[PDB]
UniProtKB/Swiss-Prot annotation, chain A:
Keyword Coiled coil: yes
Keywords tagged on the record: Acetylation, Coiled coil, Nucleus, Phosphoprotein, Repeat, Ribonucleoprotein, Ribosome biogenesis, rRNA processing, WD repeat
Main location: nucleus
Residue windows of the WD repeats: 142-181, 186-225, 228-267, 284-322, 358-396, 403-449
One term under GO cellular component: box C/D methylation guide snoRNP complex
Protein name: Ribosomal RNA-processing protein 9
Comment field (misc): Present with 5130 molecules/cell in log phase SD medium.
Domain notes: The WD domains are required for nucleolar localization and U3 small nucleolar RNAs binding.
Organism: Saccharomyces cerevisiae (strain ATCC 204508 / S288c) (Baker's yeast)
Gene name of the encoded protein: RRP9
Keyword Lipid metabolism: no
From Swiss-Prot, chain B:
GO molecular function, one term: rRNA binding
Protein name, per record: Small ribosomal subunit protein uS4A
Transmembrane stretches, start-end: none
Biological process according to GO: maturation of SSU-rRNA from tricistronic rRNA transcript (SSU-rRNA, 5.8S rRNA, LSU-rRNA); ribosomal small subunit biogenesis; translation
Alphabetical list of SUPFAM superfamilies matching this protein: Alpha-L RNA-binding motif
Species of provenance: Saccharomyces cerevisiae (strain ATCC 204508 / S288c)
Subcellular locations according to the entry: Cytoplasm; Nucleus, Nucleolus
Family: Belongs to the universal ribosomal protein uS4 family.
Gene3D superfamilies to which the protein is assigned, alphabetical: RNA-binding S4 domain (3.10.290.10)
Gene transcribed to yield this protein: RPS9A
Domain S4 RNA-binding: 96-170
Keyword annotations from UniProtKB, A to Z: Cytoplasm, Isopeptide bond, Nucleus, Phosphoprotein, Ribonucleoprotein, Ribosomal protein, Ribosome biogenesis, RNA-binding, rRNA processing, rRNA-binding, Ubl conjugation
InterPro entries, A to Z: Ribosomal_uS4, Ribosomal_uS4_CS, Ribosomal_uS4_euk/arc, Ribosomal_uS4_N, S4_RNA-bd, S4_RNA-bd_sf
Swiss-Prot record, chain D:
Top-rank taxon, per record: Eukaryota
Cellular compartment(s): Nucleus, Nucleolus
Pfam families: Ribosomal_L7Ae
Family label: Belongs to the eukaryotic ribosomal protein eL8 family.
PROSITE patterns cross-referenced by the UniProt entry: RIBOSOMAL_L7AE
Keyword annotations: mRNA processing, mRNA splicing, Nucleus, Ribonucleoprotein, Ribosome biogenesis, RNA-binding, rRNA processing, Spliceosome
The protein's role, per its UniProt record: Common component of the spliceosome and rRNA processing machinery. In association with the spliceosomal U4/U6.U5 tri-snRNP particle, required for splicing of pre-mRNA. In association with box C/D snoRNPs, required for processing of pre-ribosomal RNA (rRNA) and site-specific 2'-O-methylation of substrate RNAs. Essential for the accumulation and stability of U4 snRNA, U6 snRNA, and box C/D snoRNAs.
Resulting phenotype, R80A: Impairs binding to U4 snRNA, but not U3 snoRNA, and causes pre rRNA processing defects and an accumulation of unspliced U3 snoRNA
GO molecular function, one term: U3 snoRNA binding
Protein name: 13 kDa ribonucleoprotein-associated protein
This protein's record includes keyword Nucleus: yes
UniProtKB/Swiss-Prot annotation, chain E:
Protein name: Nucleolar protein 56
Subunit structure as annotated in this protein's UniProt entry: Interacts with NOP1 and NOP58. Component of the ribosomal small subunit (SSU) processome composed of at least 40 protein subunits and snoRNA U3.
Signal peptide: none
Miscellaneous comment in the UniProt entry for this protein: Present with 13500 molecules/cell in log phase SD medium.
Disulphide bonds in the chain: none
Result when mutating M24R: Reduced growth rate at all temperatures
Known role: Required for 60S ribosomal subunit synthesis.
Domain of life: Eukaryota
Residues included from the entire protein: 337 to 415 of 504
Family note: Belongs to the NOP5/NOP56 family.
Cellular location(s): Nucleus, Nucleolus
Length: 459, 171, 65, 121, 54
RNA sequence: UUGCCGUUGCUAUGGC
């Protein structure tokens, strides 16, 4: 029987399943291809039930869990073959986590009702230190310095991690065995973020040498290097289109890279508190941009260190909408600790009123692709879920989840169920210190673990 | 370039010696080239000043020249006036040269070390390998100066001598 | 890994063909032969090798493209 | 009236921290109070930057006495967390110094800040 | 205080570690109009914790 | 559900 027949069979059965579920079939079929048109087509934010979400925090042994990448198989309509690597792995949801202890851990997250379940791990250490001391010889199988970022391949066949060791190691998903190591070939080329082009084998790896690198995992080779940032490229986001977006931290710039045209678009906040104060007749000036996620092929959101969450449009260079001090202000330092003075009133004068106060940083920020909902994270102790307006010109706080306590290093979301009826699980790495370094003062109650929240929508 | 009016003045010889030593130039021809450029710029600025203020010619060409000089970096952002264009000197132009910028950024230990690095194709501005020391660096290109990806100092494989001695050591 | 990239694609049914400007990124490689580009262009565009012609290739100074 | 004085506003703080980051890349930054006292004693300090939230603040109130005697501009920024981040080190920094260098690539940017600190004082 | 061993290889480390903490306490005392002992205590406890560690 | 140390149930969270 020819494969044309086989596609015909799977197609015919698939239609019957659609008919069994139910005009409607035509509408549903158009929705299957909405991914091709880079426009938000998942308008379900109102349906969410933030209040009734089932939250759970799973403690993990390792210190300072830095990142988490969730792999979710998807049935390809074109060939009706699930993305799962193997038949045993059918419909199984996996999560991969990395920490500063040089350990990569995978979990099974198929069961929303149950907590994540550890499956396998591989740990690095001094054994892997390169003797040669040359960059092109930095090809040891394991890590020897902090791991920072992880990504799980859309085909489910590889998970690749990078960190301060200036290496890119790709791991086989099943056995967590090293299969290839790609050096960055730079004295300061530390990897700061990774992104898989949606439903493809291409990597975009952001490095501390102010460049973005791209790889093709299937061929195990690097393709091009992108230039233009004036400062470290802390975070990077990608969708199915080759339009990867990045943020430059202190440069206060978000650069969208059109790989197809070999051109880049510069977006700068340019928010100045003189005008913001004048129009008002406490505001903090932005210091750096850390987190970025691409809501749509034509939109993206960024989170700065001044607690400002911005919405951007490819058409406009300046932000279309900003939410200042989204996560709130840090509590004031203790007056008993500001100075050693005995007299209280003199200690209070040290606080200088409210001048010393600062806003929380947006440590994490994730948007469900082609959707109108995105999640923000900080060490305020609560994850915040937002909704973008239908016209994609504004947004509002949909709700909050109070389970998480500590620095939110990275957030992920996974869904299950039929098209109409879906349950969403929110997985976020929580650590006791910020991923890049140890600046943040220790937060009361912070614990290293994987925060979880299952949410279903009704209406 | 154009020869100065009286090349043999003692003050001129000592000036050229100082500039050469400080920026490691090869010949007085480089100094003459920069001086000729500066002379044209300053003469234009003067002729604009002679005109009346609010003159459309003065305004248009004046802001054009100020914008260009700022873009090259010689004129700072806070001095956007032709009067300061008259106050420019040859040292400002020589400083913007790629040799001097490479020296200052810390990539080389000396101006001559910077020259041999650049002429040896070890220095890249963005994506492009620039082996021309007299290359002029703008503002935006100032931060993008780095070692070229192909350079052994840039992470590629070692030069001829390194691997040759490695082979001789291994055998 | 060599990357072959087509821009300025014009369909010319008068001569019955497609014209474009091809960019070949070949890091750590001298240059990519006309024949091998004919192969990869054929595979990408789903046309026989014999139907693919390339000319006017110039490497950028310093290499890499 | 407060011990930490003058304290830079938001707009100025952004510019100060920017210079610190550039100085760190060029090896022109001395981080930490003990280094800062050493720079003032050697008189190689363009200016000193201090954290107004340093806990307790008195721990760095010896620097102004050095700064005012030797005629070196100084300023306080509200955050030690931010100051450490811009400095490029992985821990909070309460005091940092910009070493003197007339051959520096960021000379013009430094002097731009130095005038503004002087006006504030 | 190195001529009379006021603050006093592992032995050397505690001296230098203690040497810094003395400078820390001195600054608080000198520039404070009415110095207290709150910060001296937590400083000493901090030195102690280092002591058992070595 | 934790590297170590507790508390709380028959499960949940306090410190390092």
């Amino acid at each position: 029987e020819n494969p044309a027949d086989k596609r015909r069979r799977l197609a015919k059965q698939y239609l019957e399943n659609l008919k069994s579920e139910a005009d409607i079939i035509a509408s549903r079929l158009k929705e299957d291809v909405a991914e091709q048109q880079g426009r938000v087509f998942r308008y379900f934010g109102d349906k969410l039930l933030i209040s009734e979400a089932k939250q759970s925090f799973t403690r993990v042994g390792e210190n300072n869990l830095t990142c988490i990448s969730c792999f979710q198989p998807v049935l390809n309509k074109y060939t009706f073959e699930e993305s799962s690597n193997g038949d045993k792995n059918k419909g199984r949801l996996f999560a991969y986590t990395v920490s500063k202890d040089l350990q990569l851990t995978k979990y099974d997250i198929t069961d929303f009702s149950k907590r994540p379940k550890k499956l396998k791990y591989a740990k690095g250490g001094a054994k892997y230190i390169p003797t040669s001391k040359h960059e092109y010889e930095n090809t040891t199988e394991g890590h020897y310095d902090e791991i920072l970022t992880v990504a799980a391949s859309p085909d489910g066949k590889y998970v690749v991690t990078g960190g301060r060791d200036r290496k890119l190691i790709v791991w086989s998903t099943e056995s967590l065995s090293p299969v290839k190591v790609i050096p960055t070939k730079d004295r300061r080329g530390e990897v700061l973020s990774l992104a898989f082009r949606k439903n493809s084998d291409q990597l975009y790896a952001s490095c501390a040498d102010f460049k973005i690198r791209t790889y093709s995992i299937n061929q195990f080779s690097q393709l091009e290097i992108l230039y233009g940032h004036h400062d470290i490229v802390e975070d990077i986001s990608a969708l199915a289109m080759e339009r990867c977006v990045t943020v430059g931290a202190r440069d206060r710039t978000a650069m969208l890279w059109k790989i197809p045209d070999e051109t880049r678009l510069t977006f700068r906040g340019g928010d100045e508190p003189q005008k913001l104060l004048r129009r008002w007749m406490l505001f903090f000036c932005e210091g750096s941009i850390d987190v970025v996620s691409m809501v749509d092929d034509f939109h993206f959101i960024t989170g700065s260190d001044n607690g400002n969450i911005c919405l951007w449009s490819l058409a406009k260079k300046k932000p279309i909408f900003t939410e200042r001090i989204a996560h709130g202000i840090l509590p004031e330092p203790s007056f008993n600790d500001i100075s050693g003075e005995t007299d209280e009133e003199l200690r209070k004068r040290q606080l200088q009123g409210k001048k010393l106060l600062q806003p929380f940083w947006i440590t994490s920020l994730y948007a469900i692709p082609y959707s109108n909902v995105f999640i923000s994270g900080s060490w305020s102790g609560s994850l915040k879920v937002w909704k973008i307006s239908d016209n994609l010109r504004s947004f509002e706080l949909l709700g909050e989840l109070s389970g998480a306590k500590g620095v939110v290093t990275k957030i992920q979301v996974v869904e299950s169920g039929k098209h109409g009826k879906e349950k969403f699980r929110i997985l976020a790495s929580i650590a006791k210190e910020h991923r890049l370094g140890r600046w943040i003062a220790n937060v009361s109650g912070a614990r290293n673990g994987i925060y979880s929240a299952v949410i279903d929508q009704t209406g | 370039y154009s020869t100065p009016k009286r090349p043999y003045e003692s003050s001129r010889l000592d000036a050229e010696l100082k500039l050469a030593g400080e920026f490691g130039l090869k010949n007085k021809k480089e100094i003459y080239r920069i001086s000729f450029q500066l002379s044209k710029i300053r003469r234009a600025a003067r002729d604009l000043l002679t005109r009346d203020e609010k003159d459309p010619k003065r305004l248009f060409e004046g802001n054009a020249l100020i914008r260009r000089l700022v873009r090259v970096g010689v004129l700072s952002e806070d001095k956007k006036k032709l009067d300061y264009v008259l106050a420019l000197k040859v040292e400002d132009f020589l400083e913007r040269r790629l040799q001097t910028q490479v020296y200052k950024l810390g990539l080389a230990k000396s101006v001559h070390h910077a020259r041999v690095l650049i002429t040896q194709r070890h220095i890249a501005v963005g994506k492009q390998i620039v082996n021309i020391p007299s290359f002029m660096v703008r503002l935006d290109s100032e931060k993008h100066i780095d070692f070229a990806p192909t350079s052994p100092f840039g992470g590629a494989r070692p030069g001829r001598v390194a691997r040759r001695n490695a082979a001789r050591k291994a055998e | 890994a060599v990357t072959i990239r087509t821009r300025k694609v014009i369909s010319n049914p008068l001569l019955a063909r497609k014209q474009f400007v091809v960019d070949v990124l070949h890091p750590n490689r001298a240059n990519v032969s006309k024949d091998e580009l004919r192969e990869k262009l054929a595979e990408v565009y789903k046309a026989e090798k014999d139907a693919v012609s390339v000319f006017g290739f110039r490497t950028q100074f310093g290499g890499g493209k | 009236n407060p011990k930490a004085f003058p304290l830079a506003d938001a707009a100025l703080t952004q510019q100060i921290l920017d210079v610190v980051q550039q100085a760190a890349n060029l090896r022109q930054l001395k981080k930490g109070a003990n280094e800062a006292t050493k720079t003032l004693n050697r008189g190689i300090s363009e200016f000193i930057i201090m954290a107004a939230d340093c806990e307790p603040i008195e721990i760095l109130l010896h620097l102004p006495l050095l700064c005012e005697d030797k005629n070196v501009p100084y300023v306080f920024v509200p955050s030690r967390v931010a100051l450490g981040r811009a400095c490029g080190v992985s821990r909070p920094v309460i005091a940092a110094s910009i070493t003197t260098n007339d051959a520096s690539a960021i000379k013009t940017q430094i002097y731009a800040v130095k005038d503004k600190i002087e006006t504030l004082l | 205080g190195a001529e009379k061993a006021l603050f006093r290889k592992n032995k050397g480390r505690i001296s230098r570690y203690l040497a810094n903490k003395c400078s820390m306490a001195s600054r608080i005392d000198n520039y404070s109009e009415e110095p207290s002992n709150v910060f001296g205590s937590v400083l000493k406890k901090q030195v102690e914790q280092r002591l058992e560690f070595y």
